[PDB]
Symmetry: C2
Subunit: 285 residues, 2 copies
């Protein structure tokens, strides 16, 4: 542990990471594209450099917190000859394939790449209850783990550099879709004269019940089996239709439940009326 | 403990009549197809030939029918015989359908309790089972004891539409969130990961959602969407990465593309710096 690191990206996330590194006695060199002054970090000892060239020269270990992978290419391609021997830990959220391609591009330039998917907002940096998904070369990960674990606990998922972004993105698919379904349901409730406070225990109970369904179906899904022994797709379809009609009667936007309804209807069209609604995964595949 | 009529002898109606018989009720039954009642008759149910006889038997009439249309079909021709009856409608439908049925029944001198049964027929007779009820509170309280032989009750208020409202808005979450789980699982499968591998992470995300609902509840009730903990523009970018992840994995795009278009509509109406909760305005409008 050299206790020396560069942080490229000084939005809220990058700043919280630099702050914790300073607290633990690291030398911290910082840079970003808009030349933020970072006055509070500097007063705590951060070294603000002018260019990305200087930022990369400062340290072997470079933590990136950027908008996405395209930014990484923009800023690094012009300094591609300066990457030899560097370890880049990219904490930027993007796709699994972007992470894989970046890892190879860096390796071709003599650098090593670790992918991280931070699961917490900036306020969770420095807390051991916080987790980040990691993936990439295991020897490179173990060499820098101690530093990474000053920021959060680690969940190392495997050697494939895309895996940390895979686990991150599939959880966000659930997050955003389920939360928008709550807001849609709430809009219906509000049109009918009930408040969010009134809905709260029922929205919460339904959400908290979902893992039991996931636990039930998991082993069936892994066998590719959709028998209609506890539920049938045709009955599910009828249930969805009532949600759609309830939506329309309330004057609420139909797009979200109508998309749910179209998925069900495609499963019916391809012969699954008597199978479990889990058969709809075949539509998604 | 006393006496009740069950009209409609599908699986739900049969399970309810059965539990009433077990608890010592005198049970009168009718169905358009007479023979559906044979097992119940052997157990002591009184089958009657006509709807008139079934209505005459008791004050309390459970309508375990397949649709509200069936109610109109069988009761309209006998509309003069409904004074003093209390009809408990268990068909799943919209809040407005329950309201229109209640008013129709009141115009003929009857009263209407809406029920939203949350369990399959196998859950009838179990106290862990709940049914949502709504309609006149005095009518509901007069019959609560009998209704609670079937399941525990959750009375939601005087509007007959409320029992259906609470049921349908919970199903909006159920189906949309469970499809998003299947969708996410399909992406994971395309990258070599199993449902067993995804399980604790899917579970953990789902279990975290009530904490977000609790956080945003009081803000939503104030109509406040400040961007102090989250900004819509950042949400949009996050959704765009989910869409890309999906396309790269060769998985069907329709579900996350719909989410993305909601976010884009909020952006294009001037909400870049507000909380994503501001998207309730998009749902409200349209
Ligand atoms: Mg930057």
């Amino acid at each position: 542990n050299r206790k020396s690191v560069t942080v490229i990206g000084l939005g809220p996330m990058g700043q919280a990471m630099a702050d914790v590194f300073l607290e633990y006695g690291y030398s911290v060199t910082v840079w970003n594209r808009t030349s933020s002054k970072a006055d509070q970090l500097v007063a705590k000892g951060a070294i603000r450099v002018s260019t990305v060239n200087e930022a990369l020269a400062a340290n072997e270990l470079v933590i990136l917190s950027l908008t996405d992978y395209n930014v990484m290419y923009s800023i690094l391609e012009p300094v591609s000859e300066n990457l030899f021997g560097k370890v880049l830990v990219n904490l930027s959220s993007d796709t699994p394939e972007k992470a894989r391609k970046a890892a190879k591009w860096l390796e071709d330039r003599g650098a090593r790449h670790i992918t991280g998917g931070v699961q917490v907002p900036p306020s969770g940096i420095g807390k051991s209850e916080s987790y980040t998904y990691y993936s990439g070369d295991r020897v490179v990960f173990e060499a820098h783990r101690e530093t990474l674990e000053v920021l959060t606990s680690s969940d190392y998922r495997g050697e494939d550099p895309g895996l940390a972004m895979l686990y991150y993105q599939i959880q966000m698919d659930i997050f955003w879709t389920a939360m928008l379904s709550y807001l849609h349901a709430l809009a219906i409730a509000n049109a009918n004269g009930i408040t969010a406070e009134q809905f709260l225990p029922y929205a919460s109970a339904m959400m908290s019940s979902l893992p039991k369904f996931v636990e039930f179906y998991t082993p069936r899904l892994d066998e590719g089996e959709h028998p209609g022994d506890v539920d049938r797709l045709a009955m599910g379809l009828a249930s969805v239709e009532h949600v759609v009609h309830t939506t329309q009667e309330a004057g609420i936007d139909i797009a979200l439940p109508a998309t749910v309804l179209e998925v069900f209807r495609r499963g019916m069209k391809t012969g699954h009326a008597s199978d479990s609604f889990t058969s709809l995964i075949e539509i998604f595949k």
